[PDB]
Amino acid sequence: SLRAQTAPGRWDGVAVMPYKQTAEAPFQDVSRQLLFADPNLACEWRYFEVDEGGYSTLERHAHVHAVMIHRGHGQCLVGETISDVAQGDLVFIPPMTWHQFRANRGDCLGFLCVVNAARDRPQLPTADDLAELRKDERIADFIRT
């Protein structure tokens, strides 16, 4: 099968699903698209798009993420490290490592994400976790809840 790209981050036969934005939401202006999932494929391949100014939810989990930036640019926190990310960049997120993506560089930020089909659910930071992370000033300034 062929599903042609029709615009940056858009494809024929792939539906854009925005995440429902509630006042309490730990994320801002994010959508998801399912590019590949099949009973014979052990992983699922998605594309997430963070509107300009937005961010993905700060979280951690046992399952790893293989990410490639697909559209725009921005920044990410992985563990202790805040990186600039641009089109094509490869980010590996190892187990139980805090992470968050921000479209904080004047553009939207879209990335491919490959994860195992069988995986644990995300864990959000407790009050304690946030105090731990805010011991680093750079991280305190960067993170969004």
**End-to-end Cα separation, the chain, in angstroms:** 40
Q: Which helix (H) or strand (E) holds 87?
A: none
Does position 11 interact with a second copy (CB under 8 A)? The reply is yes
Tell me the Ramachandran region of residue 105: left when phi exceeds 0, alpha when psi lies from -120 to 50, beta otherwise: alpha
89 binds a second copy (CB under 8 A): yes
* Catalytic status, residue 43: no
Main-chain dihedrals φ then ψ at residue 39, nearest 5 degrees: -60, -25
For the segment 98-117, give every residue that binds a second copy (CB under 8 A). 112, 114, 116-117
| Spatial CB neighbours of 130, under 8 Å, sequence gap ≥ 6 | 143, 145
Rule CB under 8 A: choose which of 18, 25, 95, 124 binds a second copy: 95
Give 68 or 130: the residue with its C-beta nearer to a second copy: 68
Q: With respect to a second copy, which residue has the nearer C-beta, 15 or 23?
A: 15
5 SS3 class = strand
Residue placing its CB nearer to a second copy in the complex, 62 or 131: 62
Binds a second copy by CB under 8 A, chosen from 50, 58, 77, 78: 78
With CB under 8 A as the contact rule, the residue among 66, 105, 107, 133 that binds a second copy is: 66
